[PDB]
Write an enzyme that holds these catalytic residues in place. Structure first.
Site, PDB file in Angstrom:
ATOM      1  N   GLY A  33       6.692   1.909   7.779  1.00  0.00           N
ATOM      2  CA  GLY A  33       7.148   1.172   8.942  1.00  0.00           C
ATOM      3  C   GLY A  33       8.154   0.096   8.567  1.00  0.00           C
ATOM      4  O   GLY A  33       8.299  -0.236   7.389  1.00  0.00           O
ATOM      5  N   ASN A  41       0.313  -3.751   3.798  1.00  0.00           N
ATOM      6  CA  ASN A  41      -0.531  -2.593   4.067  1.00  0.00           C
ATOM      7  C   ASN A  41      -1.932  -2.679   3.468  1.00  0.00           C
ATOM      8  O   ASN A  41      -2.912  -2.285   4.101  1.00  0.00           O
ATOM      9  CB  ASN A  41       0.119  -1.326   3.499  1.00  0.00           C
ATOM     10  CG  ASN A  41       0.669  -0.400   4.566  1.00  0.00           C
ATOM     11  OD1 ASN A  41       0.817   0.801   4.331  1.00  0.00           O
ATOM     12  ND2 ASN A  41       0.994  -0.946   5.733  1.00  0.00           N
ATOM     13  N   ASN A 100      -1.064   6.039   2.400  1.00  0.00           N
ATOM     14  CA  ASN A 100      -1.052   5.812   3.841  1.00  0.00           C
ATOM     15  C   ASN A 100       0.152   6.497   4.480  1.00  0.00           C
ATOM     16  O   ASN A 100       1.293   6.107   4.238  1.00  0.00           O
ATOM     17  CB  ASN A 100      -1.008   4.302   4.118  1.00  0.00           C
ATOM     18  CG  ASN A 100      -0.848   3.971   5.595  1.00  0.00           C
ATOM     19  OD1 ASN A 100      -0.834   4.856   6.453  1.00  0.00           O
ATOM     20  ND2 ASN A 100      -0.726   2.681   5.896  1.00  0.00           N
ATOM     21  N   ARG A 172       5.772  -9.948  11.635  1.00  0.00           N
ATOM     22  CA  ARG A 172       6.281  -8.672  11.151  1.00  0.00           C
ATOM     23  C   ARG A 172       7.741  -8.501  11.540  1.00  0.00           C
ATOM     24  O   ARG A 172       8.502  -7.843  10.832  1.00  0.00           O
ATOM     25  CB  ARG A 172       5.430  -7.508  11.669  1.00  0.00           C
ATOM     26  CG  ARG A 172       3.962  -7.580  11.225  1.00  0.00           C
ATOM     27  CD  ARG A 172       3.805  -8.130   9.798  1.00  0.00           C
ATOM     28  NE  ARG A 172       4.509  -7.341   8.788  1.00  0.00           N
ATOM     29  CZ  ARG A 172       4.641  -7.702   7.515  1.00  0.00           C
ATOM     30  NH1 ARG A 172       4.119  -8.844   7.085  1.00  0.00           N
ATOM     31  NH2 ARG A 172       5.303  -6.926   6.667  1.00  0.00           N
ATOM     32  N   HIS A 250      -3.574   4.620  13.994  1.00  0.00           N
ATOM     33  CA  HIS A 250      -2.875   4.815  12.722  1.00  0.00           C
ATOM     34  C   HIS A 250      -3.033   3.588  11.813  1.00  0.00           C
ATOM     35  O   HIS A 250      -2.386   3.487  10.768  1.00  0.00           O
ATOM     36  CB  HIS A 250      -1.393   5.043  13.027  1.00  0.00           C
ATOM     37  CG  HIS A 250      -0.604   5.597  11.883  1.00  0.00           C
ATOM     38  ND1 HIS A 250      -0.902   6.803  11.286  1.00  0.00           N
ATOM     39  CD2 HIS A 250       0.516   5.141  11.273  1.00  0.00           C
ATOM     40  CE1 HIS A 250       0.004   7.070  10.362  1.00  0.00           C
ATOM     41  NE2 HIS A 250       0.876   6.077  10.335  1.00  0.00           N
ATOM     42  N   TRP A 251      -3.906   2.673  12.220  1.00  0.00           N
ATOM     43  CA  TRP A 251      -4.154   1.418  11.509  1.00  0.00           C
ATOM     44  C   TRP A 251      -5.543   1.411  10.857  1.00  0.00           C
ATOM     45  O   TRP A 251      -6.193   0.375  10.768  1.00  0.00           O
ATOM     46  CB  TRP A 251      -4.056   0.280  12.530  1.00  0.00           C
ATOM     47  CG  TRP A 251      -3.204  -0.877  12.135  1.00  0.00           C
ATOM     48  CD1 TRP A 251      -2.304  -0.928  11.112  1.00  0.00           C
ATOM     49  CD2 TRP A 251      -3.153  -2.154  12.781  1.00  0.00           C
ATOM     50  NE1 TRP A 251      -1.694  -2.160  11.079  1.00  0.00           N
ATOM     51  CE2 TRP A 251      -2.197  -2.932  12.094  1.00  0.00           C
ATOM     52  CE3 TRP A 251      -3.823  -2.715  13.878  1.00  0.00           C
ATOM     53  CZ2 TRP A 251      -1.893  -4.247  12.465  1.00  0.00           C
ATOM     54  CZ3 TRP A 251      -3.520  -4.024  14.248  1.00  0.00           C
ATOM     55  CH2 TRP A 251      -2.563  -4.773  13.541  1.00  0.00           C
TER      56      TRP A 251
END
Lengths: 271, 271
Positions: A33, A41, A100, A172, A250-251
């Protein structure tokens, strides 16, 4: 910036990485990302695993604080070379690997090219098998900076959107606009993006040859990589276990932290 | 015979059961193969769980050493009544439930009719959703006594057939011919057997209402209950986790014993 750790030359690239703990080596490979880094992460994973293993979490070339070489040719094979270069630089002859998504695809690719260098693998919402591009994935790779766009991406990753705060989106967003970040990111997966899912994937035939004990983890509600992708990996890899978390996107390492950490530690403890 | 334990009147039926450990109650419900009993199914599970929980493993009416009432009307609802009767007899107001196949279907049915009496559930290769009868299931329910027929059933359950020894086939064959056993068993699921899969199942609508934290476990190579059945349960139950063991058949608690025990204990430890 806590995302900045130690530095080491790996595969000819100055690499930012974290190294915590002693014993059996475990390499953690982050996702793809905007603004992503090994620390971002894995910050909630490293502490748990480092109590029983030596945890190495590097920023893959083109991401985080690792150098971004001019005219560098980003590709599955070059990233695999970077992973192997990192292991060589640290005298890590064999290690377990946790990947991941994007990182899971790299883990598979590394195990196929350097089978003897990889022990057990944990693939979380991993790339590695061809699947049709999702709107979530296209939004992530098609990201351009803005707090609203980052908030949207975080929402795409999360099952419980209450975790997506203005502060997190702001932090972020700030990470995504650091010098050179959006530049290398935007040039990484240009449209049409299906090309990159396909390029990062490994063939069914090759995946079936993997001898490694493998733990496949996926969030039922994952909006980026479909659950079907991990179900497929579960049919292809022989010594595999599949663990699907309901009420999880997705986390996974963030929304099911304790469960994830426990599963991973026990899985490696078997070795 | 170690399969014989303690006796207690439950729902008007003299019931054979095992009770080991202290603390939070956990009820283990066995499957429906010929000669099956709570001990036969759970002997390698009870020791591990009883170190942290009070484990109750009863022989369901019509199976094992529990009384087989004359003209007794076997059915999903009557079996649920038996489970509740056992809990009432032991002053177990609420408990976690672990169900193996047939037992998993009963666990679901019990949670739907007596929601407040059931806490967390572990469903292993469980019945509960309609699926097309498999040759494996028809062979199990259509069993008639013989060492070769029992060897075949054990082979159907196992992934690694090296575990199916002449001695094991002989011992289970002997268990299947005990007085009254084959009689109640053969009259339980007569042809056409699809009727019983359907009768033991719960509706999609009802399953979606389950509020319980649930752990769904299945062996990838299961020849009796298809993996697709557990994948479906994984889509229907909200607070669910799915764990699929590769290189494992319908004998999960036997072929992945340590992994199974660890997952179950940690799952209950969260409560």
């Amino acid at each position: 910036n806590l995302e900045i750790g130690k530095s080491i030359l790996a595969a000819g690239v100055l690499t930012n990485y974290h190294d915590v703990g002693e014993g059996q080596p475990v390499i953690l490979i982050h996702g793809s990302g905007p603004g992503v880094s090994a620390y971002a992460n894995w910050r909630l994973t490293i502490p748990a695993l480092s109590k029983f293993y030596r945890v190495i979490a590097p920023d893959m070339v083109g991401f985080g604080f690792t150098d971004r070489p001019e005219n560098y040719n980003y590709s599955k094979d070059s990233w695999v070379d970077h992973i192997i270069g990192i292991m060589d630089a640290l005298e890590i002859e064999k290690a377990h690997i946790v990947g991941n998504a994007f990182g899971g695809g790299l883990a598979i690719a590394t195990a196929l090219r350097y089978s003897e260098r990889v022990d057990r693998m944990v693939l979380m919402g991993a790339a590695g098998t061809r699947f049709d591009v999702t709107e979530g994935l296209n939004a992530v790779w098609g990201y351009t900076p803005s707090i609203e766009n980052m908030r949207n991406l975080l929402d795409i990753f999360a099952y419980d959107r209450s975790l997506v705060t203005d502060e997190l989106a702001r932090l972020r967003y700030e990470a995504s606009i650091q010098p050179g970040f959006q530049e290398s990111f935007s040039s990484m997966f240009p449209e049409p993006r299906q090309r990159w899912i396909d390029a990062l994937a490994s063939s069914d035939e090759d995946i079936k040859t993997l001898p490694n004990e493998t733990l496949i983890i996926h969030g039922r509600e994952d909006q980026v990589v479909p659950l079907s992708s991990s179900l497929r990996l579960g049919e292809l890899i022989d010594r595999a276990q599949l663990h699907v978390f309901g009420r999880c996107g997705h986390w996974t390492q963030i929304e099911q932290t304790d469960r994830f950490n426990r599963l991973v530690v026990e899985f490696f403890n078997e070795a």
